[PDB]
Amino acid sequence: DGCLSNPCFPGAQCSSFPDGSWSCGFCPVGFLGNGTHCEDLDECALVPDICFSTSKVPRCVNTQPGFHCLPCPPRYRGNQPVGVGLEAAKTEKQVCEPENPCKDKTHNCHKHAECIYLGHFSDPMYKCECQTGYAGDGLICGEDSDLDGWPSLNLVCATNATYHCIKDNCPHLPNSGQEDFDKDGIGDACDDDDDNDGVTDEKDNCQLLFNPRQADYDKDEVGDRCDNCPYVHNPAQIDTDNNGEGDACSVDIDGDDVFNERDNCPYVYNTDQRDTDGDGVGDHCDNCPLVHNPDQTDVDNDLVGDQCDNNEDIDDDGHQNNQDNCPYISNANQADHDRDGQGDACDPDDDNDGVPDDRDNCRLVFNPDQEDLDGDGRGDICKDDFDNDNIPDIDDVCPENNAISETDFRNFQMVPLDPKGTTQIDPNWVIRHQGKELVQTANSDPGIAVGFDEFGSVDFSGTFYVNTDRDDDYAGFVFGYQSSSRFYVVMWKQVTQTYWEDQPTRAYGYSGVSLKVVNSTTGTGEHLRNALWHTGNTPGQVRTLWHDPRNIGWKDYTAYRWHLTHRPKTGYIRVLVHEGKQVMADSGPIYDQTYAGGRLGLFVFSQEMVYFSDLKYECRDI
Ligand SMILES: *[C@@H]1O[C@H](CO)[C@@H](O[C@@H]2O[C@H](CO)[C@@H](O)[C@H](O)[C@H]2NC(C)=O)[C@H](O)[C@H]1NC(C)=O
Ligand SMILES: *[C@@H]1O[C@H](CO)[C@@H](O)[C@H](O)[C@H]1NC(C)=O
Ligand SMILES: *[C@@H]1O[C@H](CO)[C@@H](O)[C@H](O)[C@H]1NC(C)=O
Ligand SMILES: [Ca+2]
Ligand SMILES: [Ca+2]
Ligand SMILES: [Ca+2]
Ligand SMILES: [Ca+2]
Ligand SMILES: [Ca+2]
Numbered sequence: 001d002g003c004l005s006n007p008c009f010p011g012a013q014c015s016s017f018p019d020g021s022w023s024c025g026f027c028p029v030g031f032l033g034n035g036t037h038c039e040d041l042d043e044c045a046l047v048p049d050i051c052f053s054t055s056k057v058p059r060c061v062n063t064q065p066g067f068h069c070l071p072c073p074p075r076y077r078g079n080q081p082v083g084v085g086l087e088a089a090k091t092e093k094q095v096c097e098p099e100n101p102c103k104d105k106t107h108n109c110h111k112h113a114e115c116i117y118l119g120h121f122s123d124p125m126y127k128c129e130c131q132t133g134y135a136g137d138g139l140i141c142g143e144d145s146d147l148d149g150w151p152s153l154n155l156v157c158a159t160n161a162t163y164h165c166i167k168d169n170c171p172h173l174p175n176s177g178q179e180d181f182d183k184d185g186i187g188d189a190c191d192d193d194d195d196n197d198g199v200t201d202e203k204d205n206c207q208l209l210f211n212p213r214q215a216d217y218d219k220d221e222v223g224d225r226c227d228n229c230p231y232v233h234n235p236a237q238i239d240t241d242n243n244g245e246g247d248a249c250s251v252d253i254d255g256d257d258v259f260n261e262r263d264n265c266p267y268v269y270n271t272d273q274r275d276t277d278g279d280g281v282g283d284h285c286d287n288c289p290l291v292h293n294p295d296q297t298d299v300d301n302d303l304v305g306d307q308c309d310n311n312e313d314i315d316d317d318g319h320q321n322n323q324d325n326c327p328y329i330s331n332a333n334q335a336d337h338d339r340d341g342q343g344d345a346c347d348p349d350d351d352n353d354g355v356p357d358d359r360d361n362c363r364l365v366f367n368p369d370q371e372d373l374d375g376d377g378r379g380d381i382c383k384d385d386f387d388n389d390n391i392p393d394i395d396d397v398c399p400e401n402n403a404i405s406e407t408d409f410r411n412f413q414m415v416p417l418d419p420k421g422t423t424q425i426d427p428n429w430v431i432r433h434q435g436k437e438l439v440q441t442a443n444s445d446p447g448i449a450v451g452f453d454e455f456g457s458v459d460f461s462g463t464f465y466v467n468t469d470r471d472d473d474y475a476g477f478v479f480g481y482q483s484s485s486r487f488y489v490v491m492w493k494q495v496t497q498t499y500w501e502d503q504p505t506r507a508y509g510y511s512g513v514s515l516k517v518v519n520s521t522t523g524t525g526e527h528l529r530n531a532l533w534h535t536g537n538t539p540g541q542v543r544t545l546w547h548d549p550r551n552i553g554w555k556d557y558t559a560y561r562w563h564l565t566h567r568p569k570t571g572y573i574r575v576l577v578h579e580g581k582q583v584m585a586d587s588g589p590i591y592d593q594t595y596a597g598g599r600l601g602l603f604v605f606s607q608e609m610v611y612f613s614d615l616k617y618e619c620r621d622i
């Protein structure tokens with residue numbers, strides 16, 4: 001009777017009584033609950049927590065009737081609850097899983113490519129890379145038999161990709177720089193005449209310049225047209241300041257105005273000529289800037305002069321106590337991004353923005369308000385370049401390190417492991433591929449060319465190839481280099497041969513890939529030399545950590561890929577060696593914590609014409 005006049009909020013049940021009076025009971029599950037006047041319920045706030053929070057707070061939206069979860073944010077995948085009502089809210093809860101296109105097998109990498117997970121917060125979260133033996137952009141991979149990252153033919157990958165998709169100009173000889181000076185499609189490395197001037201480039205005194213007459217004023221055997229000091233003798237053509245004018249014929253080799261003899265750092269540009277300790281050697285080239293030492297002797301080759309050098313490095317990261325910005329905690333790269341003097345590794349706020357590391361969506365880039373206006377768990381300020389060194393995550397070999405972005409051995413320290421008088425034949429390094437390929441030429445004393453970038457966790461991989469048939473001795477690479485008495489080395493001999501110096505101790509070098517660690521109590525010299533050559537332990541010198549029990553040696557003219565894995569925090573070390581696309585050797589997991597990181601470098605011991613091609617190092621915690 002009285003319920004005909006719809007007096008109860010729509011959705012509510014209207015009870016009508018015999019005397020025309022009525023009562024409002026229900027409220028449409030989703031509304032407050034007076035009966036007649038009924039308002040919207042907030043299933044979200046002040047009730048449960050049934051939407052997935054991205055480490056933020058605002059994930060549940062409230063609607064007029066009912067409620068609505070927000071779809072899992074970027075980097076996540078899952079359901080998206082929708083409900084009208086109050087009992088629909090306690091039951092049903094949003095579940096988001098962290099994406100992983102590799103382990104999810106949802107990527108689109110070539111059948112001969114690898115899906116490589118780049119880390120949860122990485123931009124992007126993954127990439128495709130062609131496997132050893134192949135080359136391309138990752139969506140398309142072709143044959144790469146010399147393992148230099150360039151394939152044998154152009155691929156449909158050609159015009160929409162920068163590298164790795166154009167025909168290798170020396171299909172059988174590693175030349176990952178692909179330098180082809182005369183542009184005749186035959187690359188320099190395998191070109192009989194690199195300038196097409198008709199003078200075969202072994203007899204050409206200007207390999208990379210046209211000059212058929214071979215005009216050579218001074219007979220330093222570097223023709224006039226390419227000679228940077230055409231009138232003075234200078235076969236090495238060294239040009240410190242790289243201005244076309246060679247050191248030889250220059251009164252200022254480093255172009256800092258301060259003339260050579262006056263210059264207290266003649267090889268290093270320094271106009272203020274500061275000489276704190278007054279030893280005649282300027283700060284920018286003093287390996288002991290606070291301590292007197294004109295001679296600058298550095299017997300363990302760690303770039304710290306003997307007078308400074310006390311070797312006391314209590315956390316084995318290779319930086320001695322008085323020079324380690326985290327004296328007690330291992331940090332070989334000494335990364336200190338906010339420059340406050342307190343090393344990242346022992347610093348709770350790496351960018352000094354107020355928000356500590358373990359709660360910061362841009363750990364390296366100052367941003368106290370944590371703008372993440374797209375909900376990807378990463379601050380929009382460090383959107384594509386987590387370390388803000390202007391090189392983006394995908395192209396960054398150390399995405400969480402503003403001091404490394406590219407593999408670059410262009411500047412390297414030459415570490416002689418057995419120096420003497422004559423009979424001292426030093427290695428000879430040629431640089432190509434802007435520092436990503438080195439060739440050792442001579443039959444030399446043991447030696448390393450160590451690069452300067454420093455690492456903790458690291459992956460180091462290179463192509464190994466001996467472009468000659470003379471000899472059967474050692475090559476390889478060092479890692480964790482700290483001093484010439486402290487480093488991990490991987491070396492590989494072709495034919496087992498006992499070293500030709502009985503003294504100090506006999507050394508039997510077997511064939512196969514070797515993993516050694518060096519803790520030498522004498523430093524560079526005969527004892528260490530033999531110890532390096534010797535397959536096995538040598539007290540106070542070298543400890544072999546693993547050696548391919550099959551003793552397989554390397555073959556001539558044969559491309560190998562090495563891959564180093566090193567995680568000093570735990571001491572994990574793993575060495576892969578590929579022959580073409582097939583794993584030929586694998587150290588399995590190894591454990592050694594002698595050194596908590598350090599530098600990378602390339603190692604030779606009495607083997608000439610050794611090609612270390614297409615080198616890549618990456619930070620694998622960084
Ligand atoms: C490398 O070896 C050196 C010496 O061979 C080690 O230094 C010695 O460590 C022993 C512990 O077994 C101490 O008793 C000695 O006092 C040390 N010798 C001196 C005076 O230098 C050193 O521990 C090793 N370095 C590492 C493992 O990083
Ligand atoms: C019918 O609806 C109107 C709503 O204004 C209400 O005033 C009236 O009391 C209802 N029924 C009765 C009891 O006459
Ligand atoms: C890259 O460009 C080429 C141009 O023809 C195309 O064939 C290729 O499929 C492109 N890559 C992708 C993402 O499909
Ligand atoms: Ca609601
Ligand atoms: Ca190739
Ligand atoms: Ca090649
Ligand atoms: Ca050429
Ligand atoms: Ca050539």
Ligand SMILES: [Ca+2]
Pocket residue numbers: 182184186191192193194195196
């Ligand atoms: Ca040519």
Ligand SMILES: [Ca+2]
Pocket residue numbers: 193194195196197198199200201204206207
């Ligand atoms: Ca020539």
Ligand SMILES: [Ca+2]
Pocket residue numbers: 195197199204205206207208209210211212
């Ligand atoms: Ca020439």
Ligand SMILES: [Ca+2]
Pocket residue numbers: 216217218219220221222223224227230
């Ligand atoms: Ca000349």
Ligand SMILES: [Ca+2]
Pocket residue numbers: 218220222227228229230231232233234235
């Ligand atoms: Ca000259």
Ligand SMILES: [Ca+2]
Pocket residue numbers: 239240241242243244245246247250253
């Ligand atoms: Ca110059």
Ligand SMILES: [Ca+2]
Pocket residue numbers: 252253254255256257258259260263265266
């Ligand atoms: Ca100068």
Ligand SMILES: [Ca+2]
Pocket residue numbers: 254256258263264265266267268269270271
């Ligand atoms: Ca100078």
Ligand SMILES: [Ca+2]
Pocket residue numbers: 275276277278279280281282283286288289
């Ligand atoms: Ca000085």
Ligand SMILES: [Ca+2]
Pocket residue numbers: 277279281286287288289290291292293294
């Ligand atoms: Ca000094």
Ligand SMILES: [Ca+2]
Pocket residue numbers: 298299300301302303304305306309
């Ligand atoms: Ca030193």
Ligand SMILES: [Ca+2]
Pocket residue numbers: 300302304309310311483
């Ligand atoms: Ca030292």
Ligand SMILES: [Ca+2]
Pocket residue numbers: 313314315316317318319320321324326327
């Ligand atoms: Ca230290």
Ligand SMILES: [Ca+2]
Pocket residue numbers: 315317324325326327328329330331332
């Ligand atoms: Ca430290």
Ligand SMILES: [Ca+2]
Pocket residue numbers: 336337338339340341342343344347349350
């Ligand atoms: Ca700091």
Ligand SMILES: [Ca+2]
Pocket residue numbers: 343344345346347348349350357
């Ligand atoms: Ca930190």
